[PDB]
């Protein structure tokens, strides 16, 4: 399965999705800079509308514990 095919379900907790992401990211062998680009970009983009909304409110500069606690009720 390709990294672009990794997406969050409509009922799937973000948490379970983030695990899937760094597992597939774990099978990507690209430069770190590209993998940083993938992190800030693709993760949020394939996140579900309800959490996506939430993550837009965190702004930039956000870290994984704060994202992970931010989308917990969703």
């Amino acid at each position: 399965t390709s990294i672009l095919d990794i997406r969050q379900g409509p009922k799937e907790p973000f948490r379970d999705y983030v695990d899937r992401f760094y597992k597939t990211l774990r099978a990507e062998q690209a430069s770190q800079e590209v993998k940083n680009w993938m992190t800030e970009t693709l993760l949020v983009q394939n996140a579900n509308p309800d959490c996506k909304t939430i993550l837009k409110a965190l702004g930039p500069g956000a870290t994984l514990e704060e994202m992970m606690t931010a989308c917990q009720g969703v």
Partner: protein
């Protein structure tokens, strides 16, 4: 493998059955998963080419992958021979011969020869050259076997 003895010399000792079985069990359980590569790397510490063919030959199952790897090992070996040409004139009595891709793959070399190269001064890391080919070929597999 070639290990250091108490006396302070490098000597060959055989690999252990529950090491062998641990190699088997990893492959059984985690198939093509990435954790197989660090795992391999740890269990290949101080290992010979001969021991590395033993580990590859003792696989059961996943024969499409095993063939892809073989063919990668030969490609990487063909590439070794290409990049490193044979050297000028006859081999010296005082010296031992330079390896080819097939000596690195363990095929054309004997154990005592594999111990000569590694234990001698300077030593040549024919394990680590095969190891990269294995890891490279492991990447090929991992990337393919991603679904």
């Amino acid at each position: 493998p070639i290990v250091q003895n108490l006396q302070g010399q490098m000597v060959h000792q055989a690999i252990s059955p529950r090491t062998l079985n641990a190699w088997v069990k990893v492959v059984e359980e985690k198939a093509f998963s990435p954790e197989v590569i660090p795992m391999f790397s740890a269990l290949s510490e101080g290992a010979t080419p001969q021991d590395l063919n033993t580990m590859l030959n003792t696989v059961g199952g996943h024969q499409a992958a095993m063939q892809m790897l073989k063919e990668t090992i030969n490609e990487e070996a063909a590439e070794w021979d290409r990049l490193h040409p044979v050297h000028a004139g006859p081999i010296a009595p005082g010296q031992m011969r330079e390896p080819r891709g097939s000596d690195i793959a363990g095929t054309t070399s004997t154990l005592q020869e594999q111990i000569g190269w590694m234990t001698h001064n300077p030593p040549i890391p024919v394990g680590e050259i095969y190891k990269r080919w294995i890891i490279l070929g492991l990447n090929k597999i991992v990337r393919m076997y991603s679904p």
